[PDB]
Amino acid sequence: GICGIMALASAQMYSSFEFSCPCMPEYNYTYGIGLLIIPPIWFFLLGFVLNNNVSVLAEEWKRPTGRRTKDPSVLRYMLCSITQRSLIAPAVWVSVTLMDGKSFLCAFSINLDIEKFGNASLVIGMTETEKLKFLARIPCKDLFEDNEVRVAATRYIKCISQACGWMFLLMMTFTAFLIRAIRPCFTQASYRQEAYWAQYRANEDQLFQRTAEVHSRVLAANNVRRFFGFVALNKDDEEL
Amino acid sequence: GICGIMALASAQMYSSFEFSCPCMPEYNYTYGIGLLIIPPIWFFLLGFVLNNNVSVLAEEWKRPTGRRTKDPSVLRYMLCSITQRSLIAPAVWVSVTLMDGKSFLCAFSINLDIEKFGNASLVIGMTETEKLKFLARIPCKDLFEDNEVRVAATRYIKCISQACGWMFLLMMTFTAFLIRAIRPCFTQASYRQEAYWAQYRANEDQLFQRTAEVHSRVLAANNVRRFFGFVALNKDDEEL
Amino acid sequence: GICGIMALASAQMYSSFEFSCPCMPEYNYTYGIGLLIIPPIWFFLLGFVLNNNVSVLAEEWKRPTGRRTKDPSVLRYMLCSITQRSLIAPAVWVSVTLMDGKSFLCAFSINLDIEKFGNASLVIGMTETEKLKFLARIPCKDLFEDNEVRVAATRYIKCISQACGWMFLLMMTFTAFLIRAIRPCFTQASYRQEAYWAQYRANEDQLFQRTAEVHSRVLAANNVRRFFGFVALNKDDEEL
Amino acid sequence: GICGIMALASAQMYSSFEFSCPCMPEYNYTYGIGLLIIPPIWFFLLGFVLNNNVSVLAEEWKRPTGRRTKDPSVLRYMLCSITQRSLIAPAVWVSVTLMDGKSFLCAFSINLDIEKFGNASLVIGMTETEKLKFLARIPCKDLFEDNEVRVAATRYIKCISQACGWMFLLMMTFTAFLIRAIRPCFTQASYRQEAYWAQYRANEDQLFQRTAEVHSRVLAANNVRRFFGFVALNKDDEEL
Amino acid sequence: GICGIMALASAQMYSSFEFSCPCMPEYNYTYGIGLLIIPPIWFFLLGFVLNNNVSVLAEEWKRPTGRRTKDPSVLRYMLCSITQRSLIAPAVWVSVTLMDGKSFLCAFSINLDIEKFGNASLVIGMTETEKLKFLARIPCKDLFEDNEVRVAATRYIKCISQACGWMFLLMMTFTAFLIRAIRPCFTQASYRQEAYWAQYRANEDQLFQRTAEVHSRVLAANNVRRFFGFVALNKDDEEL
Amino acid sequence: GICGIMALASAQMYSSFEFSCPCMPEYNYTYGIGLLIIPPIWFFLLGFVLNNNVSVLAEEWKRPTGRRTKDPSVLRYMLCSITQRSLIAPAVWVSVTLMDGKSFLCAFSINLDIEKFGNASLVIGMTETEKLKFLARIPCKDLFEDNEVRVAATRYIKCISQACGWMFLLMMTFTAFLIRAIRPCFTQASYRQEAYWAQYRANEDQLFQRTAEVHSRVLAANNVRRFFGFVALNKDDEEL
Amino acid sequence: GICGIMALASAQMYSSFEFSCPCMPEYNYTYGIGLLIIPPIWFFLLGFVLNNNVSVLAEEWKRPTGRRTKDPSVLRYMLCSITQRSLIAPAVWVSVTLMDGKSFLCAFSINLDIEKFGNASLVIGMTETEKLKFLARIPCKDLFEDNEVRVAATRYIKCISQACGWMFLLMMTFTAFLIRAIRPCFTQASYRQEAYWAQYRANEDQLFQRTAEVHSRVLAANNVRRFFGFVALNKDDEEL
Amino acid sequence: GICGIMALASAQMYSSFEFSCPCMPEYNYTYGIGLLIIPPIWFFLLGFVLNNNVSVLAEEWKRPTGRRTKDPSVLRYMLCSITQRSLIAPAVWVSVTLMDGKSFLCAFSINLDIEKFGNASLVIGMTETEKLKFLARIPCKDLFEDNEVRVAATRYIKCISQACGWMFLLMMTFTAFLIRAIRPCFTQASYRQEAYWAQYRANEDQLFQRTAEVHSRVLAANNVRRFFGFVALNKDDEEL
């Protein structure tokens, strides 16, 4: 479906994105956490734009009451099904980013205790501004000279990022399991009036196709006789 | 089926997961054993969410008695078949993790006796805090300097992990062999009333499809005549 | 469609374009920003040329009123649908250029503060003309001798370029989400008179095909009898 | 069949199993011989679980006599055919393990006479505990320093393992040749009553399919008329 | 079409052409600019030769008036459509040559100011004849010894060549957009008399095919009876 | 056929067998010659087990006379055709093993005269036990230090093994040519009574299939009416 | 045909045969010339065994006269066509072996004059036994130390082997051209009585198939009625 | 056709032939020129053997006059068409050998003037026997020590060989162009009596097929009734 291709595209944009973490302390956090948050808000609003039933939902909330074709508990159902469909490409991005651990490493490596992984005399002798500037280059593979305290710290934050990646997949799946145990009682067999209005819209456009094409057959025959001096019809006269 | 693709996806997430064991003693055990346990609880609740008959099971336990369409021994059968289907992707993860031995090596390498594999003078001269910090880096391939006591200890715990991986596959298969010898007497030919209710639900939605589409044909013809000034019907009138 | 192939061609011209940033201060900005701007104006006017309904739109604005076949609110709808279709290959170019960060690096690397990334004694000792000529060669990989302040500065501007690339995709998607919530009330079911005129044009050309081909059958039979001395007709006489 | 895929899977699990023999004398024997024995007991009980006629066999032994549908010499035939089908994936594992010789090398290399292959002064000077610890690391390729007495001893036990692998294939094939010369007189044309009960079960489930689906057609038509206010039937009425 | 394959062949001849710029000052300009200009004049006259309607156009301008089958405003339309079709393979060559920048580098590298890119003492000490002979070998990769002023100058002229390559694509697309807004009023629905004459020519040749083949059937039957002494006709007599 | 796949499998087991010749004098001969002999006896008894007409042959020799369906000269013909079919996978193994010469080299390299190929002073100075232990390691490529007398002796015994491999293929083919010149007079057109009994067995099982399936149709209809309260038959009633 | 696959298999056995020429003077000639001669006698007797019309030819020469179905000049024609078909896989082996020159090099390199190719002082100083042992190792690439007189002598005998390989292909083709100019007068249109007996044998076996299968239908129906108590026939009764 | 595959096989035997030019003066010429000449005489007589109309031509020249079915000017036409078909695989060999120049280099490099290509002091100091032995090794790439006079002489004779290869293709094509301008007047429409005799032979063998197969049907029915006691005919009786 559309959410099968958006789940595949969210994992595929992560693979072709080249993570380019700055190594500065005031721009580490907003780049690292911003890349966790802002591509879900993009993949969520993409899940509204590519779901054409929000255009139907738009014009139903526009009219005043009396003309409205659904109950407000049926317009609220269209809201909830278009939402919990479009929350798969966000949550594939947030889970793939957290298992890979590049974004926790960029965002949180100015918060480390560098005593725990290696040489404490790396940092004894620098000011707190230079302390942060030493720590902030840990994600940046080709700007950090120590390879033992780099490997020990990118392993610790890739671990804690994978712990938060599994507790996220466990609270997302336990949420979606709670709505396969509750939300059928929220719909209460109103999806049939949704599916009747779905079929009513689809055939009304198709009946508009055959009627306008037949109305086109009428105008085209008069225009062709005026064209060269000849009116001509093959088995396109069978609708005429 | 769905459990053929979940058994394949559980083995495939293990291959594309990159194991990133920390090398610290307080975070070794919870990372190693947590990766044995928490992805089965995820693959189990995924086996409920992607099995739509729990949505049917949900609304049958919601109503009071008198309206309920099954016996409570038939609702309990739906519970048992949806359970013992969804226990294959857990047990493929726990068996693949135990044959590979990376998770027993992370979790249990602070428990070793380092005298048994090599140089006892590696550890004579360090405190018990530094003793654990020496032992805990055994999984971490690029943080451990000795390669003889690393190879001897990751071979010993990959062995014991494969012994526990075969005694797990033997107690899982001897359990599933006990339910192919008992559980047909637990069902007691009640699956036919389940399969009758299965066919009753499926055709009721399909008969709702043809009836609403025919009801859509009625409303679309009146709407098209009001649309441009023309009502038109091809062999879509054959249901009309 | 045509906008599926133009979105694919815009990303494909970026991959096969070889970025050749000059390293001079007066030609850095106009090359870098000009490559952000001028290939969108090309991909936009390409989206008008390859959309043949602008040729229809052209001759409808050419005639005086009384002869015109649409309302001016229907000619304005053809303008808006041909515009917001053709704005996808620009915005795929501007997003791919901003995620790659090569154009912000060319354009904005004469604006840097070189103190923030490394050796301040690189530039103490040169005039402001030579200061710019030192800084301007930062994009030019094989003209810059320092590799630490090159890697630190192309990482900082590839970051800020990716921040502007995500805030662009978020203001483009939030704009297109605002027109899936407003613009159906701007069209107001006038697309049917557009689709009736679309079908009226298409069948009028096809009826001109069959009538001129039948008129061709009349002239070809008289010409063949004058040709060798023989008039001959197979089942091409079935339209005759 | 199922035994074609289990013979292929048993050879395929051996290829993807990574043999990880410990190098200790008390854990060599139980790892080496345990890997010869315990994956046959798994592949045997897998040959019962994936053969659904044991579920039929289960409920026939459950009932008391008088109700039982076979003779006890026909239930014993179902036992013997399900056994000698399921003994192919064990015997492909035991033959592939014995031709490869890795399991005899792990299990039996503490039993060697190290005088027969090379330097006798390797072991003159160590205690019998260190004698076993020297010999036990012969399978372990990267823990043994001598390469002449390693190559001479893994060649001797890979030979004796291939001798036992051919005398196993010769006593397995001479056994199965004795049952293609005896066991047709054990069945005594009772397989026809087995095949009649096989066809009686299969069509009874299929006739339960068509009858419950027709019973589903009755309930679905009444439910659809109560659904929106319409009862509708296509050529699904042809069974109605 | 034919202009799809000529646009593909023009880009493909550029890829398989091996640019072999001389390094002399009197033959640089005519080789570099001549390769910009002369393969468009070839790809333009190839667009007339492979467009057979110029053969039709040829014999219509040959006859005197009174016999001529079109208006002179219809012969002028055939000129304009065969022209603006055949201008795509030129303009793909001129755009691909300008984005690649090899032809501006050959043609214009005797015009450079070599002070702007590097060592000014390269040229202080040579006469103006040797000055040009030094500068002219800049395109010639294996004849120029300096690699810093070579890389700085082939980057500057590949830039200015890409600036002229985008302002060419912008003045070609803005021209073709002006003729999708004007030229339908230049044709003024005379393409139907062109398409009637197109169908009149095509069926007149096909009716000449069936009539001459039937006239061939008459002569072949008389010739075969004179051949061996036998006249014979299968279902080739069905046209006879 | 079955003997096409057994000839292919016998050559394919030789390619995937890894020859692991011991280098000891008392285990050279039994490994080398045993690998020539014992895999033919396996491939021969495999040619009886996978040829189901020995199961027919088994039960015909089991009964006393008077009931027996063939003449004893027709049971002896079934013996001879099942034998000379099953002798192809042995003789492909013995020919492939003899052309490759690895088994004559293992078996017969303690029998060599080492004077004929090189340095006679290799063996002057060792006892006859050490003489055999020197000679026996000639097959073992990585245990023999001389490469001139190794290459000269494995070339001499690979020659004599290829001479015995061609005189084997010549006495096997001249034998099978003698039975295409004699054995048709041994059969004496009794294969027709074999082929009549072959067709009598095959259709008797197939007529047992249709009759038991029709008997299954009778029992399934009574069981389905007792099942839910409904007896139902589609075009499965056409045999009923 | 069969001789297309035997010509392909004879060239394919030469490619996969690994030539293993001994380097001794008494075993050079019999290995080299024996490999020219003995695989043709094998490929010739293989051309009789795989040509089933020799089994027909066998039983026609077995009977006394009066019963014999051919003339002795027609049995002699079957001999000549089965011979000159089966002489293609020999003559592809003898031509491929002679163009490759490995067998003339093994067989005839003890016959050389070593003065003609290089250092005459290689052999001045050895006895005639050591003279032959020096010369005999010329084919053996890794046993001969001189590479100039090796390359000069394996080039001379690969030449003379290719001269004998072309004069063989010229006397084989001029022979087969003499039998396409003579042997049609030897057959004298007796192949029609051969082809009538060929069709008489083939349809007699096929009519034996349909008659025995119909006789099988009679016995199977009586056996099935005695089997479970039921006689049953589908459209297998159409031959009954 | 057959001459399409022989032209492809002649070029393909040249590619897989490994040219093995001796380096001796008395065997250079006969190997080099013999390889130009003798594989055309083979590919010519192969063009007679694989053209079955020479077997027809053979038996027509065998009979005396009065019985002969063609005129002697029609038998001479069969000679000329079978000749000038079979001269394509020779002339592809002679042209491919002459463009490659290996055979002129072998044959004619004892005829060179070695003064023209390099060091004249290579040969001043050797006798005329050693002069030829120096020159004759020029084709032999790994026997000639000078690489400047080798490269200069194999370039000169590969040139003259390509000059003779183009003047051969020009005198072969100008010959075949002279027979497409003359030889249709040599045939003089006698190919129709050839094509009538071609069709008379082909249908006479096919009518012999159906008649002998029907005669086979008569004998097979009598033989089958004598076979088991049953005569049986399916739709093979439709020709009976």
From Swiss-Prot, chains A, B, C, D, E, F, G, H:
Extracellular side: 17-28, 105-157
Covalent lipid adducts (S-palmitoyl cysteine), residues: 80, 185
The protein's name in its UniProt record: Calcium homeostasis modulator 1
Activity-regulation annotation: Activated in response to membrane depolarization and low extracellular Ca(2+) concentration. Inhibited by ruthenium red.
Disulfide bonds: 21-106, 23-140
Family designation: Belongs to the CALHM family.
GO MF annotations in UniProt: calcium channel activity; monoatomic cation channel activity
Residues bearing glycans: 119
Keyword vocabulary terms for this entry: Calcium, Calcium channel, Calcium transport, Cell membrane, Disulfide bond, Endoplasmic reticulum, Glycoprotein, Ion channel, Ion transport, Lipoprotein, Membrane, Palmitate, Transmembrane, Transmembrane helix, Transport
Reactions catalysed according to its record: ATP(in) = ATP(out); Ca(2+)(in) = Ca(2+)(out); Mg(2+)(in) = Mg(2+)(out); Na(+)(in) = Na(+)(out)
A GO BP annotation: ATP export
Topological domain spans for side Cytoplasmic: 52-78
Membrane-traversing stretches: 1-16, 29-51, 79-104, 158-183
Function: Pore-forming subunit of a voltage-gated ion channel. Has poor ion selectivity and forms a wide pore that mediates permeation of small ions including Ca(2+), Na(+), K(+) and Cl(-), as well as larger ions such as ATP(4-).
Location of region: Phospholipid-binding: 42-49, 84-96, 169-179
Record has Lipoprotein as a keyword: yes
UniProt PTM comment: N-glycosylated.
Major location category of this protein: membrane
Subunit details: Oligomerizes to form hexamers and octamers. Does not form gap junctions. Associates with CALHM3 as a pore-forming subunit in a hetero-hexameric channel complex.
